[PDB]
Amino acid sequence: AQENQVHIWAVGGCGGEIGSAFEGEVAKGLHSMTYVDTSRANLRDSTLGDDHIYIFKDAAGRELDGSGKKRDENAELICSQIPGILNKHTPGKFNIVVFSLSGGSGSVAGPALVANLLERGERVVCCIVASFDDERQTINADRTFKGLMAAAEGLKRPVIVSYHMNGENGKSEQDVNLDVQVVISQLCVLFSGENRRLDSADLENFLNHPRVTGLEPTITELNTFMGYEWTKENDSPIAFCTLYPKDATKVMGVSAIYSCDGFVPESSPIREATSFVLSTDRLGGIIKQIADEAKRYIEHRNARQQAPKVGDETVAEAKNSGFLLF
């Protein structure tokens, strides 16, 4: 029982915790939100009912209890159950899939949701939080980013990603959550459809940029800025869409292949011009950073001292039940 203009998919524990701040917005009809996870451990106190919560189930129809950072543990079940999620929870006109590249559940059900929505022709913008605390997390993040790039190339439709880092500038998880919440709120205001000069076709061409730009469909990065100071550093984006308050001066000095304009209603919570910029020039740095983390963890792993193994003849001596040598 919520408005379906904007749909938020909280995938995994990181997605569910990030999106827990938008429950009141669902209560106010601003947007609809669906929790997708393999575990209910994080969702023990959510205000939203179980009709907005979907938990993956195994063959026996029993709800799972997390993947434990093992992407291949339940990948088949997730990929098989993704269409049922979209049937039960009707995807919104604009979808904001939030997931973490490091977990074993969000990093699988996130890209699966994105790929299924893109194949259905839906408009989806991802919010991504990547962590590099353990080697398994780094490998999962690298695999998920490669999979998203492959999905963008093979679906002939860009995968728009709002990339965030847990360890960037020494920020805690709370700061990253606040950043993702700001990005999601700005996207919800952009996708509300109440902007004066912004149409559905404009947003369709903005998200599916190669329709107008003609560039190769690849993974695209989304950056959000307030004011006009961002024109100096991102003067050459692929595309950008700006929402202005009342009697706000336009943005100049930006040379983009595609551009859109919108006007915020007088009652909307926007007081300065907000821009949504698409670019792929910073993807190389992200890939290099992920590869550096993977290389660091692999060089740490190769230095592991070999575990002291008991003799093979001792294992022959241990063929009795209980592995007692006597």
Residues that bind ligand G2P (CB under 6 A): 12-14, 17-18, 37-39, 66-68, 100, 102-106, 129, 131, 133, 137, 166, 173, 176-177
- Which C-beta is closer to ligand G2P: that of 144 or that of 275? 144
CB of 85 to ligand G2P, least distance (A): 15
CB of 52 to ligand G2P, least distance (A): 18
- Which C-beta is closer to ligand G2P: that of 166 or that of 220? 166
- Please give the Cα distance from 261 to 183 (Å, whole number): 18
- Which C-beta is closer to ligand G2P: that of 14 or that of 264? 14
- Please give the Cα distance from 224 to 276 (Å, whole number): 5
DSSP string, 182-200: HHHHHHHHHTTS--SS--H
Indicate the length of the chain as a whole number. 326
- Which C-beta is closer to ligand G2P: that of 78 or that of 207? 78
- Which C-beta is closer to ligand G2P: that of 218 or that of 224? 224
- Which C-beta is closer to ligand G2P: that of 44 or that of 309? 44
In this structure, how many other beta carbons lie within 10 angstroms of the beta carbon of residue 133?
Answer: 11
DSSP string, 136-150: HHHHHHHHHHHHHHH
The answer to whether residues 314 and 325 touch, using CB atoms and an 8 Å cutoff, is: yes
CB of 257 to ligand G2P, least distance (A): 33
- Which C-beta is closer to ligand G2P: that of 18 or that of 260? 18
CB of 145 to ligand G2P, least distance (A): 15
Comparing CA positions, the residue from 71, 68, 37, 39 lying closest to residue 140 is 71
CB of 69 to ligand G2P, least distance (A): 6
CB of 190 to ligand G2P, least distance (A): 23
CB of 234 to ligand G2P, least distance (A): 25
H or E element, residue 10: strand 6-11
- Helices 12-19 and 106-120 cross at an angle (nearest 10°) of 80
The answer to whether residues 223 and 277 touch, using CB atoms and an 8 Å cutoff, is: yes
Question: Is residue 35 classed exposed, middle or buried when 0-12, 13-18 and 19+ CB atoms within 10 A define those classes?
Answer: buried
Tell how strand 6-11 and strand 160-165 pair up: unpaired
